[PDB]
Amino acid sequence: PQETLNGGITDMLTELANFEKNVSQAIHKYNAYRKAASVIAKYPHKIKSGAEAKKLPGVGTKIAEKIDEFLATGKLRKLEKIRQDDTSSSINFLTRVSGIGPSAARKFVDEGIKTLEDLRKNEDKLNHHQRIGLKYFGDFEKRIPREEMLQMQDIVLNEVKKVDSEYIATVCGSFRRGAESSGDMDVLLTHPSFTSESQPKLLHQVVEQLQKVHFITDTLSKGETKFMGVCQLPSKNDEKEYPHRRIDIRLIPKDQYYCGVLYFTGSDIFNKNMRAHALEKGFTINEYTIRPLGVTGVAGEPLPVDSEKDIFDYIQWKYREPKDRSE
DNA sequence: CCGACGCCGCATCAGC
DNA sequence: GCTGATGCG
DNA sequence: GTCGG
């Protein structure tokens, strides 16, 4: 549905969500507001009353009341007030820096650090992640056109194969479902040598190679199974530089790889639906495994999975192309 | 009425 | 120094 | 804040 349909309502609910998460530190209210905003965003009619909205799942009494105030007055008194609150708006804003969460944002504002300029002037109060988040503040908020995701994927797949042609690497996320833009790049990596009952440095060797060709530019976090950092496509000698981008690389044991690919391909709604159906057929699927459930509900041992389609076959579902996993 | 609302790797803190 | 908790994503 | 056991 077009924004003009209920965009005022859904914008209000998203703003309220952000203040619950970042200022009130009420994560379940953040998700409640997000859920309400999403069910309304998909409603194909211009809402006329709170009562009409309350019929949708995730909209309750209090959001219905807020919708009534918004429809009658064009605003919400509580939102107008917190918007102009210097401390609350600064706390909310600072959490847009990757690495600054609600706790750090509150501590910064408490000691008078409220803006990007304030952070800039106080480097020694920032940890490594937060320094990177500040350095790439604008770039990290830009989306990534699919054409650049393809160029990025070209680099990742080539360098991974260069390190060891037995690696398997899959770029997941909405990109794998065919999205025309992405927010970041999520790479799932495995190697036949690595199983859940099992080489050294398997993730390190790939990260190192991507740094050696100057694709990975910074590291936010790095361990034996998960890397989170920053990358940048090369620019033509004369053209403007590409924005720096967020890339994650996860090393997963081969026997759990396709459960991971499935989960991290999504969508979120599709995953929920597939897990729901799985339980109906007596299986429990999580990010790692699919296990049979006995007649008393006791989970059995993980079942062998050698492809995404194996998982579909277990639950008697015909294979769904990533492109068709919107729900 | 009242608990659930995902989970866990990594960086860093709190406490010992 | 180690162990567990917390913040963050 | 909403849902539901």
Taking the domains of chain A in order of start, what are their residue ranges? Answer: 3-85, 86-142, 143-263, 264-326
- Give me the CA A10–C1' B14 separation in Å, rounded: 41
Rg (CA), chain A: 23
Distance CA A58 to C1' D3 in A:
8
Cβ partners under 8 Å of residue A142, min gap 6: A243
CA→C1' distance for A224 and C4 (Å) = 21
**Where would I find the beta strands (DSSP E) of A76-173?**
144-145, 168-171
Resolution, angstroms, 1 dp: 1.5
Nucleic acid strand D within 7 Å of A96 CB: no
Three-class SS state of A153: helix
Cβ of A130 near strand C (under 7 Å)? The reply is: no
Contact predicate A168/A190, CB 8 Å: yes
Q: Which nucleotide is nearest to A131 (CA to C1')?
A: B11
Whether any strand D atom is under 7 angstroms from the Cβ of A58: the reply reads: yes
Find and give the residue nearest to B9, measured CA to C1': A226
| A174 known ligand binder | yes
**What's the CATH superfamily of A143-263?**
Beta Polymerase, domain 2 (3.30.460.10)
The Cα–Cα gap between A30 and A8 comes to 18
Nucleotide nearest to A28 (CA to C1'): B5
Active site residue A29: no
A99 CB below 7 A from strand C atoms: yes
- Rounded CA gap, A11 and A44, in Å? 16
Is the fold of A3-85 the same as that of A86-142?
A: yes
Dist CA A130 CA A136 (whole Å): 10
Among A75, A45, A51, CA closest to A63: A51
From which experimental method does this structure derive? Answer: X-ray
For the domain made up of A86-142, give the CATH fold: DNA polymerase; domain 1 (1.10.150)
Strand B CB-contacts below 7 Å: A 28, 31-32, 127-129, 221-226, 287
Architecture of domain A3-85: Orthogonal Bundle (1.10)
User: What does the alpha-carbon distance between residue A105 and residue A23 come to, in Å, rounded to a whole number?
Assistant: 9
Compute the distance between CA of residue A246 and CA of residue A232 in angstroms, rounded to an integer.
Answer: 9
- Residue A72: count other Cβ atoms within 10 Å of its Cβ: 10
Instruction: Please report, rounded to whole angstroms, the spatial distance between the CA atom of protein residue A54 and the C1' atom of nucleotide B5.
Output: 19
User: Which nucleotide is closest to A25, CA to C1'?
Assistant: C7
The helix, strand and coil proportions of chain A, stated in percent and rounded to the nearest 5, come to 50, 15, 35
Question: Could you tell me which residues come within 8 angstroms of residue A17 by beta carbon, excluding any fewer than 6 positions away?
Answer: A29, A30, A31, A32, A33, A34, A37
Was A83 annotated as part of a binding site? no
d(CA A91, CA A20): 11
- The total of other beta-carbon atoms located within 10 Å of residue A318's CB is 7
Please, which positions of strand C sit below 7 A from a protein CB? 6-9
Question: Are the beta carbons of A15 and A28 closer than 8 angstroms?
Answer: no
Contact yes or no for A142/A182 (Cβ under 8 A) = no
Choose the catalytic residue: A29, A42, A66, A81: A66
Closest CA to A46 of A85, A81, A7, A13: A7
Kindly report whether the peptide bond that precedes residue A267 is cis, defined as omega within 30 degrees of 0: yes
Whether A256 CB is under 7 Å from strand C: no
Choosing among 3.40.50.20, 3.30.210.10, 3.40.50.2300, 3.40.140.10, the CATH entry for A264-326 is 3.30.210.10
**A15/D4 CA-to-C1' distance in Å:** 27
Which residues are CB-contacts of A273 (< 8 A; sequence separation ≥ 6)?
A: A327
Asked if strand C comes closer than 7 Å to A119 Cβ, the answer is no
